[PDB]
Amino acid sequence: GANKTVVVTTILESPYVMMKKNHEMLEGNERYEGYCVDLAAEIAKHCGFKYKLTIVGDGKYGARDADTKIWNGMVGELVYGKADIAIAPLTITLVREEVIDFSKPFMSLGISIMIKKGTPIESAEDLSKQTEIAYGTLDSGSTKEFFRRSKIAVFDKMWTYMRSAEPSVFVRTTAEGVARVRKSKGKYAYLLESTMNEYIEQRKPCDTMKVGGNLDSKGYGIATPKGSSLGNAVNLAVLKLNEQGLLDKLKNKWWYDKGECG
Ligand SMILES: CN1N=C(C(=O)O)[C@@H]2[C@@H](C(=O)O)NC[C@@H]21
Ligand SMILES: [Cl-]
């Protein structure tokens, strides 16, 4: 049939998608800025479609409720037909791959440790061998699942602690995790994706630090409904954009050009 505007679902997560300061005076796609806003424009240009950015209605990434079997978040919007494509820091995972299609990754990352500056922790092993400093993950996401599945002694010790810790060590959003690090006087460490950690480290108040290496290696992908015809072109566009340097240009624009910490 005739071409229609492609509905893009995305999520407010810095520096991927943010409201422009003057969004009250703006309409449509111009309300938003960030890495994924720029990426959406490039994908649409390289696939020849017009598009409308929308913020996921429930504010969530995408997980399946164990009792109802209903998918929430951006994944749900694709699964149930409410959006045509998701362009966001959505981690490529086994369970999501079963219900949606993912492009090859547009960004590489791994699980990492965030501390308040001066916290006496250098590694995951350090965290696992002590109790004074609490530590946790985003409550629904791929980081939590890495710990749930690990056979590595240190990480399994960490999961056994986190899953039963009181009060809960799990947080609702990145912003909550960061705030908890900043306000807990060194007594909370946050396990999160290296991409967010590295962004936050270069934002005022310049009071956090990434410690140690990454624990794994994964990727973010552009997602489409399973079997969608848009999937093939989007996948080729991601590879083409990487090969020409555009993805790294956008990463440097949104991470290090805008660093506030010297
Ligand atoms: C904010 N992000 N942190 C995550 C984590 O699990 O650390 C989630 C992960 C996912 O797609 O589940 N990538 C987006 C979310
Ligand atoms: Cl081991």
- The three-class DSSP label of residue 211 is strand
- Looking at the fold, whether 104 and 138 belong to one and the same domain comes out as no
Separation of alpha carbons 133 and 233, rounded Å: 47
Between the CA of 150 and the centroid of ligand 2 the distance, in Å, is 9
What residues make up the domain containing 16?
A: 1-109+219-258
Residue 5 is assigned to a ligand binding site: no
- The CATH number that applies at residue 41 is 3.40.190.10
What Å distances lie between residue 70 and 73, 79, 92, CA to CA?
10, 9, 19
Instruction: Provide DSSP, 168-202.
Output: ---BSSHHHHHHHHHHTTTSEEEEEEHHHHHHHHT
Take atom 1 of ligand 1 and give the residue whose Cα is closest. Answer: 174
Phi, psi dihedrals of residue 8, rounded to the nearest 5°: -100, 125
Is residue 48 within 8 A of residue 66, CB to CB? The reply is no
Same domain, 81 and 95: yes
User: Where do the DSSP E strands lie in the chain?
Assistant: 6-10, 18-19, 32-33, 51-55, 85-86, 100-102, 107-109, 111-116, 134-136, 188-193, 208-211, 218-220, 223-225
Same domain assignment for residues 16 and 76: yes
Resolution (A): 1.3
| Cis preceding linkage at 89, omega within 30 | no
| Tally of domains in the chain | 2
Estimate the share of the chain in helix, then strand, then coil, as percent rounded to the nearest 5.
35, 20, 40
Q: Is 89 annotated as a binding residue?
A: yes
Which two structure tokens, joined as six digits, stand for 32?
Answer: 């938003």
Please classify residue 42 by burial: count the beta carbons closer than 10 Å to its beta carbon, then call 0-12 exposed, 13-18 middle and 19+ buried: middle
Experimental approach was X-ray
Q: Is 64 annotated as a binding residue?
A: no
Which residues form ligand 1's pocket by a CB distance below 6 Å? 13, 61, 89-91, 138, 141-143, 174, 192-193
Q: Are residues 96 and 224 in the same domain?
A: yes
Element (H, E) at 42: helix 35-47
Judge whether 118 and 211 are in contact, CB under 8 Å. no
